[PDB]
Design a protein around this ligand. Structure first.
Ligand SMILES: COc1cc(C(=O)[O-])ccc1O
Length: 363
């Protein structure tokens, strides 16, 4: 009738609290900048904290759909959370907007899922190609022991070995409270040319702290990976050991576009911190909802919304992006960046751009 509800399910507490914080903030910023009304509907955002626990995600999604009667569910800080909600999204015909989780297969788990974040494969193929072409011969991998870490590993390995690289060791660490010290100790003794590192948003600072504590910034071992470890939400808290880390990713707070300059300044002014790649996922996720509603002339049923979302394209602070009409997954530039100091702060400075990269996990 007059209102349209978005059930926002994100980790506000626990290990992935920094992801939920950014997504909640970015959506608040979006509404502050665009208003809360579209095609005669007042948008209400209902926040629920699942603490990145899939059992909570499922119960909260049921409550939002059945009790609160939401038109869309959104967020999903980790892959298991997105997967937990998928059956309910399908049964209730409610779009599920994935603003964080990055495992390739997620969009295949419900015809109502649409993603505005990334897949690990998008970034992992690019850094794999780059490492091989740049004389890196022997690499040890460290990856979070769950779905997106496995994607990161597989796609990096594929491209890096195809280019003549060799993986010397593969090490996996738990999602919950990882201890990086053992892998890092191994590195100090084994001295590969580089370490490829995937850890989720929120953990890169801890990784870099143990890296610097074990003295590895003086070892000549390069750090490479997808951009998650060099999370812009965390870059400000890191020391000089992070200088020179090379990552591929879809977003940098240093992206030089007019829209990004405006977004970063607005976010900093409102929240007092730099947005990271999770904030952008949220910003674009809510934009997608607004634009869909506009396109349907305010029709709020799931089928109408999904139909409008497919093939949608717009400029994001990260660059031009679109929803693939075939897969419902995000198509976006992937940049390669080097951590450099500008005006006293560390930034992921983009030096390479690959245009409109479709998820390699579905191509
Ligand atoms: C919370 O941070 C992340 C989560 C995931 C996921 O679970 O699919 C992938 C990449 C990330 O940076």
């Amino acid at each position: 009738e007059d209102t349209f509800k978005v059930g926002l399910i994100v980790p506000m507490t626990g290990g992935q609290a920094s992801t939920g914080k950014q997504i909640d903030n970015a959506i608040k910023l979006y509404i502050k900048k665009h208003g809360d009304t579209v095609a005669g509907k007042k948008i209400e955002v209902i926040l629920k904290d699942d603490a990145a626990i899939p059992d909570n995600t499922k119960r909260l999604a049921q409550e939002l759909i059945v009790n609160d009667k939401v038109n869309v569910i959104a967020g999903f800080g980790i892959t298991p959370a997105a997967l937990a909600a998928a059956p309910l999204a399908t049964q209730a015909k409610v779009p599920e907007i994935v603003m964080a989780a990055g495992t390739s297969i997620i969009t295949e788990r419900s015809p109502y899922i649409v993603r505005t974040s990334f897949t690990l494969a998008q970034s992992s193929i690019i850094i794999g190609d780059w490492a091989a072409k740049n004389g890196i011969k022997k690499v040890a991998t460290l990856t979070s022991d769950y779905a997106p870490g496995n994607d990161a590993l597989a796609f990096f390995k594929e491209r890096f070995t195809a280019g003549g690289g060799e993986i010397v060791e593969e090490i996996k660490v738990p999602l919950a409270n990882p201890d990086f010290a053992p892998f890092l100790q191994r590195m100090k003794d084994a001295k590969p040319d580089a370490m490829f590192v995937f850890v989720p948003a929120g953990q890169g600072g801890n990784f870099m702290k143990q890296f610097a504590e074990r003295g590895l910034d003086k070892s000549g071992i390069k750090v490479i990976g997808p951009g998650d470890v060099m999370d812009d939400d965390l870059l400000n808290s890191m020391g000089d050991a992070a200088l020179g880390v090379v990552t591929a990713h879809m977003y940098s707070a240093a992206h030089p576009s007019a829209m990004n300059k405006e977004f970063v300044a607005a976010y900093k002014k409102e929240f007092g911190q730099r947005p990271g790649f999770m904030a952008v996922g949220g910003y674009d996720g809510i934009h997608l909802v607004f634009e869909a509603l506009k396109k349907t002339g305010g029709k709020a049923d799931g089928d109408s919304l999904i139909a409008a979302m497919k093939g949608m394209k717009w400029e994001s602070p990260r660059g031009p992006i679109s929803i693939d009409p075939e897969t419902r997954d995000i198509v976006q530039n992937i940049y390669i960046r080097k951590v450099e100091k500008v005006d006293g702060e560390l930034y992921n400075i983009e030096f390479a751009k690959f245009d409109a990269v479709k998820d390699p996990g579905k191509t």
